[PDB]
């Protein structure tokens, strides 16, 4: 990566809005973290709950559907870490809710395994499929922690 893209990715991760605004161009808004998993700025902003940065990147042409090296999209990151507002922003901008990574994990697998009831609910309202099996043969329901009976009920 050029130094500028590196700084952009770090700023997206840190939620440094002003630096994002300075460095975000048509050429860099969908740049990829080559030294790592080829995450985009939107992958970082989504995973680290940087809401202002997520909104800015989306407005400026960031690809909600962009897959990293593992086939994860920013929605996977938001759901894994319980960032409800970010998840809603991505979904409202057309994010595919049944998107599957290289291991066939979906956002619902993430939200279910991580005990995020409201995100599970959001995903289901948008057509997320609780019967989708990952590479291990596990559905999102299969991944729910024993104590999370509310999420079990929701997904069943």
């Amino acid at each position: 990566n050029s130094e500028a893209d590196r700084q952009l990715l770090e700023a997206a991760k840190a939620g440094d809005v002003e630096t994002v605004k300075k460095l975000c161009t048509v050429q860099s808004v969908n740049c990829r973290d080559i030294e790592g998993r080829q995450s985009t700025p939107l992958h970082f902003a989504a995973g680290y709950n940087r809401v202002s940065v997520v909104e800015y990147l989306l407005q400026h042409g960031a690809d909600v559907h962009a897959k990293d090296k593992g086939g994860l999209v920013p929605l996977h990151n938001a759901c894994s870490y319980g960032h409800y507002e970010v998840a809603e922003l991505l979904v409202k901008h057309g994010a595919v809710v049944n998107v599957a990574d290289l291991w066939k994990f979906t956002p619902l697998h993430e939200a279910a395994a991580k005990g995020k009831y409201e995100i599970c609910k959001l995903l289901l309202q948008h057509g997320a499929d609780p019967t989708k099996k990952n590479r291990d043969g596990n559905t999102p329901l299969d991944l729910v922690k024993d104590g999370d009976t509310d999420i079990q009920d929701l997904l069943r």
Binding site: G47, Y48, L72, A78, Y81, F105, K114
Partner: peptide, 12 residues
């Protein structure tokens, strides 16, 4: 083997 996604739950 699937690594954890980029990100974290708590800002703190």
């Amino acid at each position: 083997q699937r690594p954890p996604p980029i990100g974290q739950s708590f800002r703190s």
